[PDB]
Design a protein around this ligand. Structure first.
Ligand SMILES: CCOC(=O)c1cncn1[C@H](C)c1ccccc1
Lengths: 80, 48, 120, 105, 116, 52
């Protein structure tokens, strides 16, 4: 994600406001960072509770695509 | 080199003799071949 | 006078003009010089999202490594080395914009402190 | 409106000593403050135009010191005829004069 | 050349033993990263055009192939915990299905775009 | 290290000899490569004798 943003920003000028594709990349990076933090949370409470980890995994498996599709539709509705 | 490692890992835990043999052979076959290629390349391109 | 729509400043922000008259002395004589200053004020909007956001995100990603278990060496090592590589690439890229000056700006101090945090 | 605080409001100095008057503006007035000498029953006469530039016919004892906001006017070894009002007035904007300083002996 | 060599680099994971998870995950994801960088370069060659050429089509198909290899290993590892023989057969099935599909696509693409 | 080098060289022109900063980067890369070779040597003789 970082190298994609880098390859994109080399062509645009230095504009202070946030573009639309920058908002999209920020959303995607927030989703990836929340995935990584969710794994960190699983690995932290895995020794204490072995079922909470499986519960969080089974919940995330159906929760992440839903929020991503919702954000995608809201973004494409607000901009198009 | 990567393909040789892949073959070694594929033969590991089933025929470890062949894996160790080809690894000890590739510890000598790759550097000598690279040295020969370097000598040939540099010689035939500096003679001109 | 400045026109209303007359501003092509993407990054800066024109505050106002300030005129003055003076008298300079050259090797040929003594001349009259009309001076006009345009006060500019840089916009931090781009530098925030392009340097301060990745630096803070990298520092947070690196401090996440503490919440992992101690019996997981490859994961924490990967965290550390990737955060260091990212910080290095960022410290190199962000400096590229400015002219090659011989002092340390503020953004350089921020980048240095974030690098110290990742190394720590 | 650029206000000019001229100090001191009233001062007395004997003959033969360097005297310094001050005139501090509010906003920026870059070397555009003139100094006038208004004797009694007379119209003001320009002494120091620009910031430090003697008008044609001004003795060498009047000299100014300029800046962006604060300005000074020095009269070394005042004579008996240098006793008048001394007004500073900026012109970088619409001209606004100072309150003036009474010079006494 | 670099795109197909990256694709066969990704295929190499199909022979590494299924127990070594980090090796295969690193293979897949780093191959995806190099693939997107190479796609960026290839598209940066010619100017900004809003249609689909024959080169970016190739690099997109390669990107899809690497994506497919990675998700295939993901499903393999998930099914290993449920039923191992399923994944054991899936490995040897993919070993034949991937290069065959790539060769068929290359033949079709080159024939269609050379004799046009 | 190689990223630092590639970023640095894209600025300077095509120049034959070895500059001072190139010498520093080559020394740092030699030290890094020596660390990696040291680990490889340790991993080679680990199973046989961990004391050495
Ligand atoms: C919390 C949001 O994270 C980020 O914006 C972030 C941190 N590192 C990288 N990114 C993303 C790629 C980004 C940076 C700058 C502009 C747009 C997108």
């Amino acid at each position: 994600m970082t190298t994609i943003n880098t390859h994109l920003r080399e062509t645009l000028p230095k504009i202070p406001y946030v573009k639309a594709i920058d908002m999209y990349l920020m959303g995607c990076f927030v989703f990836v960072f929340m995935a990584l933090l969710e794994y960190a949370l699983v690995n932290y409470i895995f020794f204490s509770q072995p079922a909470r980890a499986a519960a969080i995994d089974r919940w995330s498996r159906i929760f992440f695509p839903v929020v991503f599709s919702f954000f995608n539709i809201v973004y494409w509705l607000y901009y198009v | 080199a990567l393909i040789e490692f892949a073959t070694v890992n594929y033969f590991t835990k089933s025929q470890p003799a062949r894996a160790a043999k080809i690894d000890r052979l590739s510890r000598i076959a790759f550097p000598l071949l690279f040295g020969i290629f370097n000598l040939v390349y540099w010689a035939t391109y500096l003679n001109r | 006078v400045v026109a209303e729509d007359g501003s092509r400043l993407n990054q800066y922000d024109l505050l106002g003009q300030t005129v003055d008259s003076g008298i300079v002395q050259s090797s040929t004589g003594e001349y009259v010089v009309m001076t006009t200053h345009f006060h500019l004020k840089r916009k931090i909007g781009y530098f925030v999202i392009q340097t301060y956001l990745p630096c803070i995100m990298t520092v947070i990603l690196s401090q996440v490594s503490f919440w992992l278990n101690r019996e997981s060496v490859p994961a924490r090592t990967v965290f550390g080395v990737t955060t260091v590589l990212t910080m290095t690439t960022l410290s190199i890229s962000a400096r590229n914009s400015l002219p090659k000056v011989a002092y340390a700006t503020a953004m350089d101090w921020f980048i240095a402190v974030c690098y110290a945090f990742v190394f720590s | 409106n650029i206000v000019m605080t001229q100090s001191p409001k009233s001062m007395s100095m004997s003959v033969g000593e360097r005297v310094t008057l001050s005139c501090k503006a509010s906003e920026y007035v870059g070397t555009y403050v003139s100094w006038y000498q208004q004797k009694p029953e007379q119209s003001p006469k320009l002494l120091i135009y620009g910031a430090s530039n003697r008008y044609t016919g001004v003795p060498d004892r009047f000299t100014g010191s300029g800046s962006a906001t604060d300005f000074t006017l020095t009269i070394g070894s005042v004579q008996a005829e240098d006793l008048a009002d001394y007004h500073c007035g900026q012109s970088y904007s619409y001209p606004t004069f100072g309150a003036g300083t009474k010079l006494e002996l | 050349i670099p795109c197909t060599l990256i694709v066969v680099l990704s295929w190499v994971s199909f022979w590494i033993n299924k127990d070594a998870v980090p090796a295969r995950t690193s293979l897949g994801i780093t191959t995806v990263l190099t693939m997107t960088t190479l796609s960026t370069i290839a598209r940066k060659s010619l100017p900004k055009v809003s249609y689909v050429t024959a080169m970016d089509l190739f690099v997109s198909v390669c990107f899809i192939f690497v994506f497919s290899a990675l998700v295939e290993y993901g499903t393999l590892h998930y099914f290993v915990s449920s039923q191992p023989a399923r994944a054991a057969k899936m490995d040897s099935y993919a070993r034949i299905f991937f290069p065959t599909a790539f060769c068929l696509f290359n033949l079709v693409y080159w024939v269609s775009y050379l004799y046009l």
